[PDB]
Design a protein around this motif. Structure first.
Motif, PDB file in Angstrom:
ATOM      1  N   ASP C  13      31.964  55.758  57.906  1.00 12.63           N
ATOM      2  CA  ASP C  13      32.688  57.006  57.710  1.00 12.63           C
ATOM      3  C   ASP C  13      33.030  57.605  59.067  1.00 12.63           C
ATOM      4  OD1 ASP C  13      33.612  59.512  56.349  1.00 12.63           O
ATOM      5  OD2 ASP C  13      31.839  60.329  57.351  1.00 12.63           O
ATOM      6  N   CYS C  14      34.295  57.993  59.240  1.00  9.82           N
ATOM      7  CA  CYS C  14      34.741  58.500  60.533  1.00  9.82           C
ATOM      8  C   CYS C  14      34.065  59.816  60.891  1.00  9.82           C
ATOM      9  CB  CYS C  14      36.254  58.688  60.528  1.00  9.82           C
ATOM     10  SG  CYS C  14      37.228  57.207  60.786  1.00  9.82           S
ATOM     11  N   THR C  15      34.108  60.791  59.981  1.00  6.19           N
ATOM     12  CA  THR C  15      33.702  62.148  60.333  1.00  6.19           C
ATOM     13  C   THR C  15      32.226  62.217  60.698  1.00  6.19           C
ATOM     14  OG1 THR C  15      33.034  62.939  58.149  1.00  6.19           O
ATOM     15  CG2 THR C  15      35.393  62.812  58.618  1.00  6.19           C
ATOM     16  N   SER C  26      36.937  68.119  63.639  1.00  3.69           N
ATOM     17  CA  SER C  26      37.726  67.505  62.577  1.00  3.69           C
ATOM     18  C   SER C  26      39.211  67.774  62.776  1.00  3.69           C
ATOM     19  CB  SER C  26      37.264  68.020  61.216  1.00  3.69           C
ATOM     20  OG  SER C  26      35.851  67.990  61.115  1.00  3.69           O
ATOM     21  N   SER C  34      46.527  57.753  61.551  1.00  6.24           N
ATOM     22  CA  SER C  34      45.852  57.266  60.357  1.00  6.24           C
ATOM     23  C   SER C  34      44.986  56.056  60.673  1.00  6.24           C
ATOM     24  CB  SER C  34      46.877  56.918  59.278  1.00  6.24           C
ATOM     25  OG  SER C  34      47.924  56.129  59.815  1.00  6.24           O
ATOM     26  N   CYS C  36      41.674  55.962  60.580  1.00  5.61           N
ATOM     27  CA  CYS C  36      40.497  55.885  59.723  1.00  5.61           C
ATOM     28  C   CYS C  36      40.803  55.199  58.400  1.00  5.61           C
ATOM     29  CB  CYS C  36      39.941  57.285  59.493  1.00  5.61           C
ATOM     30  SG  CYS C  36      39.113  57.941  60.942  1.00  5.61           S
ATOM     31  N   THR C  37      41.948  55.509  57.792  1.00  4.37           N
ATOM     32  CA  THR C  37      42.259  54.917  56.496  1.00  4.37           C
ATOM     33  C   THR C  37      42.441  53.408  56.605  1.00  4.37           C
ATOM     34  OG1 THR C  37      43.862  54.898  54.683  1.00  4.37           O
ATOM     35  CG2 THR C  37      44.660  55.554  56.854  1.00  4.37           C
ATOM     36  N   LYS C  40      39.047  51.765  57.066  1.00  5.09           N
ATOM     37  CA  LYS C  40      38.370  51.689  55.778  1.00  5.09           C
ATOM     38  C   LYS C  40      38.963  50.582  54.916  1.00  5.09           C
ATOM     39  CE  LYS C  40      38.870  55.171  52.925  1.00  5.09           C
ATOM     40  NZ  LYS C  40      39.457  54.573  51.694  1.00  5.09           N
ATOM     41  N   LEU C 250      36.611  56.019  69.348  1.00  6.61           N
ATOM     42  CA  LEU C 250      37.635  55.243  68.660  1.00  6.61           C
ATOM     43  C   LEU C 250      37.748  53.846  69.247  1.00  6.61           C
ATOM     44  CD1 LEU C 250      40.463  57.840  68.020  1.00  6.61           C
ATOM     45  CD2 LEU C 250      39.148  56.576  66.322  1.00  6.61           C
ATOM     46  N   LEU C 253      34.847  51.844  67.877  1.00  6.11           N
ATOM     47  CA  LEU C 253      35.075  51.457  66.488  1.00  6.11           C
ATOM     48  C   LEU C 253      36.089  50.326  66.385  1.00  6.11           C
ATOM     49  CD1 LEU C 253      35.043  54.828  64.534  1.00  6.11           C
ATOM     50  CD2 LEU C 253      33.552  52.866  64.186  1.00  6.11           C
TER      51      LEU C 253
END
Ligand SMILES: *[C@@H]1O[C@H](CO)[C@@H](O[C@@H]2O[C@H](CO)[C@@H](O)[C@H](O)[C@H]2NC(C)=O)[C@H](O)[C@H]1NC(C)=O
Ligand SMILES: *[C@@H]1O[C@H](CO)[C@@H](O[C@@H]2O[C@H](CO)[C@@H](O)[C@H](O)[C@H]2NC(C)=O)[C@H](O)[C@H]1NC(C)=O
Ligand code: NAG
Ligand code: NAG
Ligand code: NAG
Ligand code: NAG
Ligand code: NAG
Ligand code: NAG
Ligand code: NAG
Ligand code: NAG
Ligand code: NAG
Lengths: 180, 176, 309, 329
Positions: C13-15, C26, C34, C36-37, C40, C250, C253
């Motif tokens: 989960d990013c947040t 946030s 986009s 994170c989407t 995922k 980022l 990740l």
């Protein structure tokens, strides 16, 4: 001091959030804090009672949703991942949850599985082929009155071959099939 | 992603220039350039990773064509589910479709078997078949289709005498 | 022969990772697009592919077969591979030995869809079909046949007539039993046997430890904690430092996701090879040289293992 | 299908059905269903004392004439069976600033960044029951008023009131440009997967969505055992003190200026702290504080202050200009 509950703590200027439980780690008399392998403050000592106090993170996970299709019906089921059903239920009876829609239907029918807490379906003792995979061997299906049910996946029928020391079987007919 | 500011004043090139001094515009343009370069790098890496998988699939398809269309394959569950017979290719957008023709038996029937046969003190073994019996008489048949036949000398071969065979039977082997 | 089949499934989960419990962080993440989407999406694709691999490798039988009351198989023992109905989980002794030799902030590990017992049942059904029906159950209905006749057929596939097996049954059975007995001792004595399976777990653990370790890196900022940076100085410098930290996390990740994708592709290739080996060596006899073992091939028996076969 | 985030009226919310003064909470939704034209418009403002221009939105005869003025009639009102006037709710009037000319009358009133946005929609339905269905509201007009409004009423001589909240909505645009349907992203689990998939149709399956977190509730603070204390009994309850010329300079420490004991033991008539607030003195403790022992007259204590003059200030004891301390007598 509050234990076994989610609170905000301030120990000698160290601030954080979590659940404080009893621990068994043995600090040395000149040590105050405790740290994990990387960065987190796993343990802490009460300045007054001199007790080892495990800081444990809050519960979180996915809120994945099970639906049978908009064309068929409108009922849904919600799966909370990696949490037992005592909590979440408690956090509903006393709020302090993130998803604002909160209560789906309650109405008992809460099932607890290794994947997490399942709300909106009833567990049955039957067994057949899987339709919507959920977790460790638990699947869901829509049947009728009509509601969403969860069961244990079946690997198929059980067939026992009549083995014998002098028994053989020979086919007498065939069939031609075409596959893509 | 062209509209992402990437932590800058705005996402439009012209407005940034004609609103403030060239110095800060330098930093803002640099930020946008870095963000878009990272986006392009991510796109290219993803494309390469997908292309590797598509290359593997294409190699598999070429092998399947060469082995099932141009000939008959003995590999199990490769050119279809069952005993492979034929295959036909059909074109498709960015792909190919195979029609596999297989053979599947049915209508089973039991009976009683015996590894060897002793007729005149010498064990006998089938040359190409399996010994079966329908309760009263013994026949030799194929291994995938029922076709009984009488036991005879040119149907079987002899090897050794009858002292080591476990499930041996004492029927008659005829001679022409 | 030992082969990996799958790896652990993870979700991030990013947040909770980057902007931990901060409403001021946030907002600054929405301007980065986009990422994170799609991260995922990639992780979910890997997760579903993991279960697809296992289903393709193992679920190759329509019906579950069970052995009769274990009886004389012509002298072959098979006790070390058949399930033992005298302990929980219903495994085989070799499986038990295999199982006994293998040993946070916003990350989550998801359980496999198929439990271990289901895999054990698939293995048992495959073994029962192999030893009671032969190679016929892989191409239609299963047909019963005595085991010595099945091996007489097997020798006939390598250029050896049927005389050899029937006139040397006891010796062959004894040799098979001795080989089976020595296999267990060889596996138990040698420590570095299940190496490649342990390597996957070690790599995943190292990747996770590296990911959680870099969260304490300052990345050329004031500090590595959001609270102190926020309540010490003006909004603009706070924005600059938060942007620096966000860029660093980022990058971390992205590196983790790319590494996971490459390793997943490798494991996918290995799983395809394992499925082919199962279908061609267990359900039938293979003429390919050095494919189902060193030398002329006779049979093959599978055994389950953690994240492999 | 466009996904947007703005202030809206949440679906299945609570609506009050009816001249009370209704608060203006970041915009309101108004729907009047009458044909007698009793509701002649609205008033907007904060105090109506010639400070904020009372927005007199009146639809007198044909179309609404937005007149930003204040029109004191006489005061005492009464029922009347022409004028149709005499509303004396307000007291003071001033000069005019802006002038504009031009069932189920539903209006939306919004104000942001000094711009008053008024959205209108007039569907001549024949009926009184609350009608179900979808009706979009158009941007009738915007106004650059550049003021603040927190309270509003209705002009009398049958209506509902709602309030708006920030929310994320999913809208559907027709092949014209017309909006035909909307989907909320907070009510129900289904109308969150619908927002995630960006479509009005969801197929069978299990869909990932947002995450849940158990937020904290209490705030525990556990500071270490308190053990040390400020030595003051020897100072502020002594036996004998000294003359002014031979003053002590007693050294004290462990002092958070945490003196509440002196409040009860000694009813201080005089207490002047020329530095930080005495209540905030407990926030920071000290180290090198000095104290003095004086026995002086009555009409002399006022001389002990910064910048003062006299015999005592000039010859015995002098205070600095930036004197940070508390004098107690
Ligand atoms: C198959 O092998 C197993 C184990 O190798 C045999 O079980 C052993 O039998 C002997 C009898 O002489 C006992 O002394 C051992 O204690 C047994 N082992 C265990 C682990 O209990 C089994 O007998 C073999 N099968 C046959 C038919 O002989
Ligand atoms: C200040 O000091 C005096 C002298 O020690 C304290 O006086 C005593 O007060 C108690 C109160 O119960 C009496 O029992 C004693 O008899 C008093 N003095 C003697 C002769 O011992 C006084 O209480 C102190 N008060 C403050 C303000 O601290
Ligand atoms: C149930 O929830 C509680 C939460 O207090 C947890 O400690 C426990 O491990 C969960 N499972 C069982 C079987 O009690
Ligand atoms: C024939 O073989 C089949 C194999 O499944 C078995 O079910 C059946 O009982 C057998 N019939 C006999 C032994 O008469
Ligand atoms: C093998 O089958 C035969 C049937 O003809 C039976 O008599 C014999 O006992 C069997 N062998 C066993 C059970 O070990
Ligand atoms: C075999 O199958 C075919 C079609 O499935 C059927 O017509 C026929 O009667 C069956 N039996 C024989 C002996 O051909
Ligand atoms: C077995 O096969 C023989 C071959 O002619 C036949 O005569 C007989 O009817 C069959 N059935 C039995 C039960 O013997
Ligand atoms: C088979 O025939 C041989 C030779 O005639 C004889 O010795 C043997 O006993 C026979 N077997 C049976 C089972 O009758
Ligand atoms: C657009 O609106 C007109 C009426 O103004 C209507 O005739 C036409 O069919 C509509 N077509 C669309 C949905 O594009
Ligand atoms: C310190 O501990 C003692 C013994 O428990 C207690 O009497 C005292 O009140 C404590 N002081 C504090 C908490 O300031
Ligand atoms: C002041 O200082 C003198 C020094 O001799 C000492 O005797 C006296 O007790 C002190 N008293 C105060 C009020 O500090």
């Amino acid at each position: 001091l509050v234990k076994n509950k989610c609170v905000n703590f301030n120990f000698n200027g160290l601030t954080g959030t979590g659940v404080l439980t009893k621990s068994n780690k043995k600090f040395l008399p000149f040590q105050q804090f405790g740290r994990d392998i990387v960065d987190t403050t796993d343990a802490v000592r009460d300045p007054q009672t001199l007790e080892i106090l495990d800081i444990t993170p809050c519960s979180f996970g996915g809120v994945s949703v099970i639906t049978p299709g908009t064309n068929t019906s409108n009922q849904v089921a919600v799966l909370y991942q990696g949490v037992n059903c005592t909590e979440v239920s408690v956090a509903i009876h006393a709020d302090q949850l993130t998803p604002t829609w909160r209560v789906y239907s309650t109405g008992s029918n809460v099932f607890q599985t290794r994947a997490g807490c399942l709300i909106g379906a009833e567990y049955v003792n039957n067994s057949y082929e899987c339709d919507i995979p959920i977790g460790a061997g638990v699947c869901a299906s829509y049947q009728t009155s009509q509601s969403i049910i969860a069961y244990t996946m079946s690997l198929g029928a059980e067939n026992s071959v009549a083995y014998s020391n002098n028994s053989i079987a020979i086919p007498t007919n065939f069939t031609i099939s075409v596959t893509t | 992603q062209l509209s992402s500011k990437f932590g800058a004043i705005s996402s439009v090139l012209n407005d940034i220039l004609s609103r403030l001094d060239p110095p800060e515009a330098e930093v803002q343009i640099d930020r946008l350039i870095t963000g878009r370069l990272q986006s392009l790098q991510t796109y290219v890496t993803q494309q390469l990773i997908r292309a590797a998988e598509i290359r593997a699939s294409a190699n598999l398809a070429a092998t399947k064509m060469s082995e099932c269309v141009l000939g008959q394959s003995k590999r199990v569950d490769f050119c279809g589910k069952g005993y492979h017979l034929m295959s036909f290719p059909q074109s498709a957008p960015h792909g190919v479709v195979f029609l596999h023709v297989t053979y599947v038996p049915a209508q089973e029937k039991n009976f009683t078997t015996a590894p060897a046969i002793c007729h005149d003190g010498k064990a006998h073994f089938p040359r190409e078949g399996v010994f079966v019996s329908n309760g009263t008489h013994w026949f030799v048949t194929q291994r995938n289709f029922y076709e009984p036949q009488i036991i005879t000398t040119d149907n079987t071969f002899v090897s050794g005498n009858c002292d080591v065979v476990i499930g041996i039977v004492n029927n008659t082997v005829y001679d022409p | 022969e030992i082969l990996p089949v799958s790896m652990t499934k993870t979700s991030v989960d990013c947040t909770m990772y980057i902007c931990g419990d901060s409403t001021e962080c946030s907002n600054l993440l929405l301007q980065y697009g986009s990422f994170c989407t799609q991260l995922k999406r990639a992780l979910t694709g890997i997760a579903v592919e993991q279960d697809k691999n296992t289903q393709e490798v193992f679920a190759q039988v329509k019906q579950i077969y069970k052995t009769p009351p274990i009886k004389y198989f012509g002298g072959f023992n098979f006790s070390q591979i058949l399930p033992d109905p005298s302990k929980p989980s219903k495994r085989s002794p070799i499986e038990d030995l295999l199982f006994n030799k293998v040993t946070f902030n916003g990350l989550t590990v998801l359980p496999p869809l198929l439990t271990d017992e289901m895999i054990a049942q698939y293995t048992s059904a495959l073994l029962a079909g192999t030893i009671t029906s032969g190679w016929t159950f892989g191409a239609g209905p299963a047909l019963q046949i005595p085991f010595p006749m099945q091996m007489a057929y097997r020798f006939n596939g390598i250029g050896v007539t049927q005389n050899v097996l029937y006139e040397n049954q006891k010796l062959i059975a004894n040799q098979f039993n001795s080989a089976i007995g020595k296999i267990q001792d060889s596996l138990f004595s040698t420590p570095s046997a299940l190496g490649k399976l342990q390597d996957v777990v070690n790599h995943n653990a190292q990747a996770l430890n590296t990911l959680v370790k870099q969260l304490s890196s300052k990345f050329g900022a004031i500090s590595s904690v959001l609270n102190d940076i926020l309540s010490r100085l003006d909004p603009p410098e706070a924005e600059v430092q938060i942007d620096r930290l966000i860029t660093g996390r980022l990058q971390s990740l992205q590196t983790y996701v790319t590494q996971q994708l490459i390793r997943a592709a490798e494991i996918r290739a290995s799983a395809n090879l394992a499925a082919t080996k199962m279908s061609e060596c267990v359900l039938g006899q293979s003429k390919r040289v050095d494919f189902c073992g060193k030398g002329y091939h006779l049979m093959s028996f599978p055994q389950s293992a953690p994240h492999g076969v | 299908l466009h996904l947007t985030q703005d202030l809206f009226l949440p679906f299945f919310s609570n609506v009050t059905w009816f001249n009370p003064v209704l608060p203006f909470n970041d915009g309101v939704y108004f729907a009047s269903t009458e044909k007698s034209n009793i509701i002649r418009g609205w008033i907007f403002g904060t105090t109506l004392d010639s400070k904020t221009q009372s927005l007199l939105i009146v639809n007198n005869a044909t179309n609404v004439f937005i007149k930003v003025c204040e029109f004191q009639f006489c005061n005492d009102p009464f029922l009347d069976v022409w004028m149709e006037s005499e509303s004396g709710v307000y007291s003071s009037a001033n000069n005019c600033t802006f002038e504009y000319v031009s069932n189920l009358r539903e209006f939306v009133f919004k104000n942001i960044d000094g711009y008053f946005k008024i959205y209108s929609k007039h569907t001549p339905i024949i009926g009184r029951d609350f009608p179900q269905g979808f009706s979009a509201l158009e941007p009738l007009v915007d106004l650059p008023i550049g003021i603040n409004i927190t309270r509003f009423q209705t002009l009398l001589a049958d209506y509902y009131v709602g309030y708006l909240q920030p929310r994320t909505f999913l809208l559907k645009y027709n092949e014209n440009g017309t909006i035909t349907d909307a989907v909320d992203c907070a009510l129900d689990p289904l109308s969150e997967t619908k927002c995630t998939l960006k479509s009005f149709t969801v197929e069978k399956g299990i869909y990932q969505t947002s995450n849940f977190r158990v937020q904290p509730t209490e705030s525990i603070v556990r500071f270490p055992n308190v053990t040390n204390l400020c030595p003051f009994h020897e100072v502020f309850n002594a036996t004998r003190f000294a003359s002014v010329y031979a003053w002590n300079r007693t050294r004290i420490s462990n002092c958070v200026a945490d003196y509440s004991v002196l409040y009860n033991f000694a009813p201080f008539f005089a207490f002047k702290c020329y530095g930080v607030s005495p209540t905030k003195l407990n926030d920071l403790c000290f180290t090198n504080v000095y104290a003095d022992s004086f026995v002086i007259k009555g009409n002399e204590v006022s001389q002990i202050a910064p910048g003062q003059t006299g015999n005592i200030a000039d010859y015995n004891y002098k205070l600095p200009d930036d004197f940070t301390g508390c004098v107690i007598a």
